[PDB]
Structure formats: C-alpha cells, structure tokens
C-alpha cells in the first residue's frame, strides 16, 4: 500500500475513533523505514496512546474489582483471569511500539526534537509495562524506562528551550514515572518544579504556535505538583 494511502486511512480511522486501525496503518507506514514527518509522528503517537490508554483504563477497573471481591473466590478468580488477559493485550501493544521505536524511529531520527519525542515515548511504554509487571522482570522494565527518559532529558536540556512542548511533556511524564513507579515523590516534585520554573522564566519568548500546547503542559505540571505536595 502506498505511504500516502496508509496515512489517509489513519486520518479516517482517527476521525472514526478507530485507534486500533490507526495503529495498524501507522505501523505499516513506520515499517517502510523512512523518517516520519511531524504529522506522521503525531498520528503514530495518537494511535498507540489511545489503544494503550483504553487497556490501562480497563486494567485499573478490573484490578479494583479483583481487590473488592476478596472473600468471593469464584468472582475474584474471574476478575483475576480477565485482568491477566488485559495485561497480555497491554504487553503486546507496548512491545509492538517498542519494536517500532528501536528498529525504525530512534535510529532514523535526524533531528533532536524527533529523538527526544521517540525516547520519551520509549520511556512511556516501558512505564506502562512496569505498571503491570510482577516479579524479577519488573526491575529490568523499570531500568529501561528510566534509561530512555534520562537519555531524552540529556538531549532536551542541550538542544531545546525550556518552553518547548516536547521538553515540557518529557518532564511531565518523567515526573509521573518518579512518583508512580519509583515511589520517589521528592524527585518527582523536584523535576516538575524545575521544569515549570524554567519555562515560566522564559514564557515571554514563546511563539504563538507553541503557546497553547506549552501552557496546557505547564498547567498539568502545576496540578501534579499540587497533588503530590498535599500527599
């Protein structure tokens, strides 16, 4: 199928909220091995963010039902079996994206922006794996998430303005990793506060095109700081 036909199908699938079809189209675009445009990169991100987000939401609900059915053995067992099914689907979705990131996107990224975007995304998908991981495998998944975020962060600090939407979005997601996965609220708050304060100090330099996206991400950083400092 031509690259343009697949991208047009992904856009039709997006308008129909068919994110599994969008992911299959954008996978088939990525596996052609050409560097993605900013539009194609964003379509790939939206596709797999919605597909994984749906499974994570289902997993949290079913995990809460398994916990609340304690003492009802048959109901608890049915909730467990259904949780483990969703964890398998989530693992398959994450490993699919991680394979695309490692084979086609990170190696072919020519620009610092694209590298930080894909390394942030690598950190996000290992973080989603770490949320559902149990036993000894969890440590290796956590280390991979942390490595991908640190590599993204080192590039973003050198090559990107504090007000840049992707650098802010990296600080947001990496602060959530420190909080939810590493149980390190002081590191989460320190990172989120530093990124917010640096971006406030330079906010007057921001272009009209990036203004909406950066200010929305700065708002989310502030809301997380408020939540984690009350806890």
């Amino acid at each position: 199928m031509d690259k343009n036909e697949l991208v047009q199908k992904a856009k039709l699938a997006e308008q129909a909220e068919r994110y599994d079809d969008m992911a299959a189209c954008m996978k088939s675009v990525t596996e052609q091995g050409a560097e993605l445009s900013n539009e194609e990169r964003n379509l790939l991100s939206v596709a797999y963010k919605n597909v994984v987000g749906a499974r994570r939401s289902s997993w949290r609900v079913v995990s809460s039902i398994e916990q609340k059915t304690e003492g009802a053995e048959k109901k608890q067992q049915m909730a467990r079996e259904y949780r483990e099914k969703i964890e398998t689907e989530l693992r398959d979705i994450c490993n699919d994206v991680l394979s695309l990131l490692e084979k086609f996107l990170i190696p072919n990224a020519s620009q610092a922006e694209s590298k930080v975007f894909y390394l942030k995304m690598k950190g996000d998908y290992y973080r989603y794996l770490a949320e559902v991981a149990a036993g000894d495998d969890k440590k290796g998944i956590v280390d991979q998430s942390q490595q991908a975020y640190q590599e993204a962060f080192e590039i973003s600090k050198k090559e990107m303005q504090p007000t840049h939407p992707i650098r802010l979005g990296l600080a947001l997601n990496f602060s959530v990793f420190y909080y939810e996965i590493l149980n390190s609220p002081e590191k989460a708050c320190s990172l989120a506060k530093t990124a917010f304060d640096e971006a406030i100090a330079e906010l007057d330099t921001l272009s009209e095109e990036s203004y909406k996206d950066s200010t929305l991400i700065m708002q989310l950083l502030r809301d997380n700081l408020t939540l984690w400092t009350s806890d």
Binding site: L172, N173, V176, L220, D223, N224
Partner: peptide, 5 residues
C-alpha cells in the same frame, strides 16, 4: 487523576 501526555 494526575496528567500525562
């Protein structure tokens, strides 16, 4: 709940 993007 806390925000990610």
């Amino acid at each position: 709940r806390r925000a990610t993007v």
